[PDB]
Design a protein around this ligand. Structure first.
Ligand SMILES: [Zn+2]
Lengths: 120, 82
């Protein structure tokens, strides 16, 4: 029964441009605001609700295409570009740096999620 | 489902609109679909045509179909059945 805590961070209008490097892109503060009034059932329930809220924020929703907002409305992560694709991993990933502290969660591309857990 | 030319436009459309509906398909499905659609289209863009459509490019199902069909033609590859 899962709860989320954390502040997140203020973000720009190219939220996921950094998702390729380091630990990625942060949970945005306004999203965090909403997620902390919720209850979850798994990190999976957390993930789906995370995408949901993204779809609804004026200032984030604007950065995704229609077909992407369409996924995120039912809790699926946005598809990456094809060039950031790896294997059968085609959408953006949450990475946990360790009940859900959103100040240690972030958003990465697949190939960066890869490198992160193989120590590069 | 062997080439774009095994397909009627109407047939391809239904396929595209399906890809484009997110509660239509489990994620492993969509995956198969999306991979088919790049094979069918031989478009260099692939599924950026679906999710990173360029500025002012009609991204409805028909809008995609259309684009495929206009590119495919100025390249002159094969088109749809009938
Ligand atoms: Zn991870």
């Amino acid at each position: 029964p899962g709860k989320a805590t954390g502040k997140g961070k203020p973000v720009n209008n190219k939220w996921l441009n950094n998702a390729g490097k380091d630990l990625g892109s942060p949970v945005p503060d306004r999203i965090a605001n909403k997620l902390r009034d919720k209850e979850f059932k798994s990190f999976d329930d957390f993930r789906k609700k995370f995408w949901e809220e993204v779809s609804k924020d004026p200032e984030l929703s604007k950065q995704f295409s229609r077909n992407n907002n369409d996924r995120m409305k039912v809790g699926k992560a946005p598809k990456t570009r094809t060039q950031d694709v790896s294997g059968k991993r085609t959408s953006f990933e949450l990475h946990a740096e360790k009940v859900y502290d959103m100040d240690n969660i972030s958003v990465v591309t697949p190939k960066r999620h890869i490198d992160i857990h193989r120590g590069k | 489902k062997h080439s774009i030319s095994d397909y009627t436009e109407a047939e391809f459309l239904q396929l595209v609109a399906t890809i484009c509906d997110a509660d239509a398909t489990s994620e492993e499905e969509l995956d198969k679909l999306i991979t088919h659609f790049g094979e069918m289209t031989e478009h260099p863009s692939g599924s950026d045509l679906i999710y990173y459509p360029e500025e002012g490019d009609d991204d409805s199902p028909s809008g995609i179909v259309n684009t495929v069909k206009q590119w495919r033609a100025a390249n002159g590859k094969s088109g749809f059945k009938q």
